[PDB]
Amino acid sequence: LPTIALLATGGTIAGSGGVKELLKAIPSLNKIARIQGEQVSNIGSQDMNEEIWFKLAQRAQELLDDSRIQGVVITHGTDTLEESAYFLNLVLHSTKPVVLVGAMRNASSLSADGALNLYEAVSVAVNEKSANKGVLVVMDDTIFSVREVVKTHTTHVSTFKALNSGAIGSVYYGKTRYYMQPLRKHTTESEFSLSQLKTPLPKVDIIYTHAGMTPDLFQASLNSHAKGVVIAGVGNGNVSAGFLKAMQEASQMGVVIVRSSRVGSGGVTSGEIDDKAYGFITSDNLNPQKARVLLQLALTKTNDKAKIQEMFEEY
Amino acid sequence: LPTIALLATGGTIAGSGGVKELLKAIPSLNKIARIQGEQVSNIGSQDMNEEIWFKLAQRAQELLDDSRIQGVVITHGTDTLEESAYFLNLVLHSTKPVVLVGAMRNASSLSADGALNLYEAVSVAVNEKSANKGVLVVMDDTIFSVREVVKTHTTHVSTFKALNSGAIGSVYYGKTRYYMQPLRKHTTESEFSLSQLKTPLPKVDIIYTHAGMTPDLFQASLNSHAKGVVIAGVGNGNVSAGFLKAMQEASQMGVVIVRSSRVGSGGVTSGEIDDKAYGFITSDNLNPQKARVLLQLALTKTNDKAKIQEMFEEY
Amino acid sequence: LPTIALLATGGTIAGSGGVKELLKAIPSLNKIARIQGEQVSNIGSQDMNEEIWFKLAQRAQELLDDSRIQGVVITHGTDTLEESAYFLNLVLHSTKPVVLVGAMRNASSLSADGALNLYEAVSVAVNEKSANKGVLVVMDDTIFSVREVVKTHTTHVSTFKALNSGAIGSVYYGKTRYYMQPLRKHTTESEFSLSQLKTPLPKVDIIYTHAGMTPDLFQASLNSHAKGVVIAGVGNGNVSAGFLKAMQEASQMGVVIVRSSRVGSGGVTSGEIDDKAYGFITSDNLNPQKARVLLQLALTKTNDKAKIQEMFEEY
Amino acid sequence: LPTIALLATGGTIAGSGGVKELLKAIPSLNKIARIQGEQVSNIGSQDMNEEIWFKLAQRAQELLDDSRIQGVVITHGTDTLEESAYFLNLVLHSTKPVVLVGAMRNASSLSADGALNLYEAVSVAVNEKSANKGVLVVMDDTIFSVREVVKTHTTHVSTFKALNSGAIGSVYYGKTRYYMQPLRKHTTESEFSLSQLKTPLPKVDIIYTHAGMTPDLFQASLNSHAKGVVIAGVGNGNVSAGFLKAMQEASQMGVVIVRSSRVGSGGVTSGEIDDKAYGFITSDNLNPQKARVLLQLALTKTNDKAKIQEMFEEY
Ligand SMILES: N[C@@H](CC(=O)O)C(=O)O
Numbered sequence A, B, C, D: 001l002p003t004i005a006l007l008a009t010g011g012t013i014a015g016s017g018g019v020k021e022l023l024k025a026i027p028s029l030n031k032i033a034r035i036q037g038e039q040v041s042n043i044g045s046q047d048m049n050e051e052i053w054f055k056l057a058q059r060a061q062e063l064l065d066d067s068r069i070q071g072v073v074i075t076h077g078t079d080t081l082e083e084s085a086y087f088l089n090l091v092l093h094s095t096k097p098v099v100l101v102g103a104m105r106n107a108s109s110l111s112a113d114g115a116l117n118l119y120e121a122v123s124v125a126v127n128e129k130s131a132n133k134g135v136l137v138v139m140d141d142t143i144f145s146v147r148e149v150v151k152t153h154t155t156h157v158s159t160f161k162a163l164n165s166g167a168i169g170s171v172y173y174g175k176t177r178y179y180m181q182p183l184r185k186h187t188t189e190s191e192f193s194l195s196q197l198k199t200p201l202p203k204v205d206i207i208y209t210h211a212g213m214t215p216d217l218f219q220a221s222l223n224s225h226a227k228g229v230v231i232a233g234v235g236n237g238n239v240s241a242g243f244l245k246a247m248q249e250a251s252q253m254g255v256v257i258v259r260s261s262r263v264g265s266g267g268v269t270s271g272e273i274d275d276k277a278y279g280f281i282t283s284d285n286l287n288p289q290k291a292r293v294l295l296q297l298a299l300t301k302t303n304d305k306a307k308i309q310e311m312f313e314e315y
């Protein structure tokens, strides 16, 4: 049987009222792979931070570099799973499958979703076709690419969706089928690597907008020495006149400003705002939290606005 | 023919490269109603603020109180339309139809959506069945209730959706059908009224959350004398341990804290956070920007957490 | 505790590799209601037929008429659940809650969905607010009205959706909230009643359409003495020229022809076809299988096309 | 400028109350391509048939083989556009872009969608990145692959969706971005070619199922010398016991039986039906009308059930 490393971080999948505990609860896993489990952390994903991301990434890369390891499965809380998944997609250098999985119902709930989710996740990680597709997220019988996947609902077991594109494949009781290949750069084609990164990453805040908005929190972010700011703008990345004036002054001072959107789907374009006039960056179709991940990494490399915009076009 | 008042505020529906200009561009409107048009403002809805909301609401109420006016149509930019619509739903006291409408493509675009949107909006406002349903939003052949409607995409003409419930009716080239009646309190059943409200409304900020979150912007909001704060939490209104400690201290000091979600749909429940232990409010299934509207209004009446939670259950 | 009758018919909820078996498997049910269980049938819902519908409806009505019964829960396979639910919505005369529930994963599956589905279903049936809302379907933490609900996916646990409107409420671990009230006639306001109905119901076939369509199967339906035919037309109920000519001749001969759509959502309108010229009926926004249910019932009352079209506008 | 051939077939895009008429109505097209227009037919797509498909395919292939032609755009009614698109995806042998486009509102409607749809379609056809992606469908600012795209609503301008996967790219006022590459075989990798095909194609009927189903129409299809039958089954391709017995006898007699689903999305699996025991084929995640297209083509090559099932796994 193929050897799979299972890296546990915590989350509702391990919620109750770590490894293993899991594996012990699903003996059928032993028919499809040899599992090498370890505990990376034991937290709710609401407490996920850079220190854990780096520990997780370093350990994953070490295992991926081992010729005896065929793939890696990571159990993770669902709340920030989309952020961890995108971070790993950009920093891991391997063609072997890396699969994140969680659960929306705690392990002792009636009709808990975790057991079958974990069973498919392992099935996807051992499949030959899962290679070279970047970091994957397997939830609710569906296979998503890391760039595209978002948590869309507070409580539904089907909360994960790819709002701009769609799922790249399906998995039903272990049977895996792919229909689509992601085109944006990932993993081995990424210019980012762990050996070139150090904690802390550059500070990047996210500012929310609404009717009657004022730039006071935006100014507070600048005062706190933010190196970049992602704006969750209204509609197509829009902001009030007063907000725009503050953004212009910030960008002139060398703070990198990214226009994203609070709406949840679709690309941000120039149009009502002339981004080239002020040196702003548009966040493609990434939501604010994924735009922050890419911007934090970009800022370790460069402050050049043209180069950063190119990264948003490629990743 | 029935008399309809048309109140124009600006937006992409009146975008190019006010009244009327519109009406002049759609002569077929004269077959279905007598239109009394006026300009309330001429702004992008990204610049919407309390001063305009109050001017708009006062004028709408005056017209609704006139026995010669059968209904009111308001043209508005799409970016903050969901916020204005919910504000009006809570402060207008009439059973007559009030309909908001906008356009996603500017008036001089190929295949501009505004003309047909405005034609249906007027058709809905003159329909007898449109009475007693609260404030309505008509976009892309669909009729939505003000509480439920959200802009979900940056650029699509079908951007408006009701993610938690659904549309209450359809309108196709003026032909109107209703299938559902909203149950949450609105308009005439609302405890809020214009004669009891004054500008400025209590200050309420919205704080976004993400992996590696820190309460620094939250603290800045407190320092700026916010009376309430809406948290756009991860998943089911969740926050990091450090954030929770700051929220606890704030609530003890008398600042009203509402747990909402960044995810975009679903209700926020107690569960991982014991709201009753700390005096926090959960925002039902309202997104952060609509939760802010209700909280601003609540704070003109009371600071009592139990009473505010009841408002989130009723409105 | 309130008394609830549980009527079991079969389905994947009782699938393995009847009552009770269920109840025995979920002891927490005893804390919320006194359950009176009985087996109406034990079949896959793919084998559902009129004989079982009548047995089920008669038994449900008898129980609903009993002052000791507070509500009725019916366990049913998911494949034809939307058809049974709509049939009951039209023939049961009671204001007490009737709730249908099923499961997408068999009872011995990892992460089986049936237990929690049944727990909520019972919770909805005992809730005072569930009265006067017509027949309800509870699946995957969601409450749907019988007219609107459709199975949209072959295998997903979240397969049920209301594509034209939306869910009327939510239920999360027994906690029930309603947001919308259905407006189309149901239950006590229905003109159909069991005491006026006999098996067999009038024969109604459904004909599918596609590119290169020919009316040969349509003709076979006529030859088999169909009293009505529902056409699952392309787009807005459309058919080829040759098909239209056959439909015209059929309608002239007294066969009732209903134009529905294969597409899955939206209302069918006159437009490319002048229904009034030929005496055709349009199926509102009902899909072909629900249009068949209403037409079968209509045909027990009348053959008058104007009266049948009015039924499609009211139910 | 690049030369694009525009092949017009009819449809609502050319509806009123052919070429050009179109082009004449959109002069901005001349800035992006040299257009060579011709009329292939002038029909509603509800009247689409094999004779027109073959004329259209032959003409498209001839143009694609011309070194002076950079791409082909086909205007088509929306009702059967998904069927024509999939047929062309399987029979055209070229890496050059072939793009189908239509309109949901007639050309003289307020806010007609056709002009901007056609402008993007041409923009996609001239883009270098559009090559090698199979046949494309461009509607409502979105780029879909031919295998995946379905019409889901009777009247909405956003009616086209890819329910199992998602859109492969976006186009906004001519600006094109791709995010995904289709993996199933198409165009140059297809084993089907025009030079090996003749009209009429083998007869294949589609049978709809519902509660109280009987195999009478299925038998009528056999009597009409159908070579294959696609069943639009309930849920996961399911049928009544009586229907299954008829299907078994048919398959034993050499008629090829494909289990599809009426539900609209998801793959059909073996499970409740042992397909291998009876020689049935499952239609992957194709809906009944697209399964019919592939089966008609399969039957020109072979009657071998194993080989036909492999085609459903590859195309
Ligand atoms: N708060 C939990 C939610 C979950 O896992 O579903 C976490 O993200 O760890």
Ligand SMILES: N[C@@H](CC(=O)O)C(=O)O
Pocket: A235, A238, A272, B010, B011, B012, B013, B043, B044, B045, B046, B076, B077, B078, B079, B080, B102, B103, B104, B105
């Ligand atoms: N920014 C514009 C967008 C629109 O109207 O579509 C506004 O909201 O006024």
Ligand SMILES: N[C@@H](CC(=O)O)C(=O)O
Pocket: C010, C011, C012, C013, C043, C044, C045, C046, C076, C077, C078, C079, C080, C102, C103, C104, C105, D235, D238, D272
């Ligand atoms: N074929 C099964 C499917 C299910 O229940 O999920 C039935 O409808 O009985």
Ligand SMILES: N[C@@H](CC(=O)O)C(=O)O
Pocket: C235, C238, C272, D010, D011, D012, D013, D043, D044, D045, D046, D076, D077, D078, D079, D080, D102, D103, D104, D105
């Ligand atoms: N019946 C028309 C519908 C459309 O084009 O939108 C056709 O398919 O030709």
